[PDB]
UniProtKB/Swiss-Prot annotation:
Activity regulation details: Inhibited by S-adenosyl-N-decyl-aminoethyl (SADAE).
Superkingdom of the source species: Bacteria
Function: Involved in the biosynthesis of hydroxymycolate, a common precursor of oxygenated mycolic acids (methoxy-mycolate and keto-mycolate). Probably transfers a methyl group from the S-adenosylmethionine (SAM) cofactor and, subsequently or simultaneously, a water molecule onto the double bound of ethylene substrates, leading to the formation of the hydroxylated product at the distal position. Involved in the activation of the antitubercular drug thiacetazone (TAC).
Mutant lacking the gene: phenotype: Cells lacking this gene result in a decreased permeability and fluidity of the cell envelope due to a drastic difference in the mycolates pattern. The parent strain makes three types of mycolates (alpha-mycolate, methoxymycolates and ketomycolates), but the mutant contains most exclusively alpha-mycolates. The mutated strain grows more slowly in the lungs, spleen and liver of mouse and is cleared more rapidly from the liver than the wild-type strain.
Catalytic machinery residues: C248
InterPro entries: CFA/CMAS, CMAS, CMAS_actinobact, SAM-dependent_MTases_sf
Similarity comment text for this entry: Belongs to the CFA/CMAS family.
Known EC number: 2.1.1.-
GO biological process: lipid biosynthetic process; methylation; mycolic acid biosynthetic process
UniProt-recorded name of the protein: Hydroxymycolate synthase MmaA4
Residues at which S-adenosyl-L-methionine binds: Y16, S17, G55, C56, G57, T77, L78, S79, K80, N81, Q82, W106, E107, I119
Length: 270
């Protein structure tokens, strides 16, 4: 997967996550900023604080946080591509706030921060590591800390929609977690909430982003579709991602997949 490839289907910001069409008539690009504001507005961010962005992408969330809230920022990513971009994105801001991006996972991060944002990185963590993740996030934050985690989710193998559809969905999901995001693994919303509660977080009712992901995958699908040619010369990979995009839209429509924005409040939050 090359940067030039994703360039032919994503908005100019290169946000590789669910957009937020509020109001409904926003551009994909506008909708990606609105999704960033949706997360940050939950975080009770005050000037001088340090915001930790876990899985920080091309640095879009962090830039918007410095600009909108007058905070310091630290970003974690496991991609050199993303790290160098973020670094130049951060260095370009007119601020005296510190900005730092580290090529490393949350597992090796242990510094005090005030607030945490994480948009669709959580699918890479592994069920096995959820307890450590939430414990780390609770422990690095002050008494009034808050964290948002946004993540696609599925449902426990038990959770009825027909035998036919449930076997089918399990397979399509295998394919995502194998050839699109190798090593990935979807949680359920219930797991997201429960592991946070066990670490001692108060967890309000999660926000479902389902119709927004449906809307996002359609624009993605449609834009890649229109570059059938331009994308092939940069056929195999093309048909793979078309199966992925059209497939997810379908299963989000069918209500076999969902996307949750979960907020985690420490006992002393405001
Ligand atoms: C609708 C689709 C259906 C659901 C399919 C599974 C979802 C796949 C996730 C796609 N969301 C993309 C957001 S970008 C992921 C970011 O998280 C980072 N990351 C991954 N693991 C860690 C980690 N352990 N620590 C810090 N950062 C991490 C990557 O470097 C990257 O910047």
């Amino acid at each position: 997967v090359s940067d030039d490839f994703f360039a032919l289907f994503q908005d100019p910001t290169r946000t590789y996550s669910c957009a937020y069409f509020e109001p409904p008539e926003l551009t994909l690009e506008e909708a990606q900023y609105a999704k960033v504001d949706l997360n940050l507005d939950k975080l009770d961010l005050k000037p001088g604080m340090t915001l930790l962005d876990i899985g920080c992408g091309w640095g879009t969330t962090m830039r918007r946080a410095v600009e909108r809230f007058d905070v310091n920022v630290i970003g974690l990513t496991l991609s050199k591509n993303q790290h160098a971009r973020c670094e130049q994105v951060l260095a370009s801001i007119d601020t005296n706030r510190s900005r730092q991006v580290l090529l490393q996972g949350w597992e090796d991060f242990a510094e005090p921060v005030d607030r945490i944002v994480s948009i669709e990185a959580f699918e890479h963590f592994g069920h096995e590591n959820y307890d450590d993740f939430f414990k780390r996030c609770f422990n690095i934050m002050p008494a009034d800390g808050r964290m948002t985690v946004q993540s696609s989710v599925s449902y426990h193998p038990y959770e009825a929609r027909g035998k036919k559809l449930s076997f089918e969905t399990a397979r399509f999901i295998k394919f995502i977690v194998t050839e699109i995001f190798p090593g990935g693994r979807l949680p359920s919303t219930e797991m997201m909430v429960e592991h946070g509660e066990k670490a001692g977080f108060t967890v309000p009712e999660p926000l479902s982003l389902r119709p927004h992901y449906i809307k996002t995958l359609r624009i993605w699908g449609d834009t890649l579709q229109s570059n059938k040619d331009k994308a092939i010369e940069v056929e195999e990979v093309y048909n793979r991602y078309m199966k992925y995009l059209r497939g997810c839209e379908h299963y989000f429509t069918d209500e076999m997949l969902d996307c949750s924005l979960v907020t985690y409040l420490k006992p002393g939050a405001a």
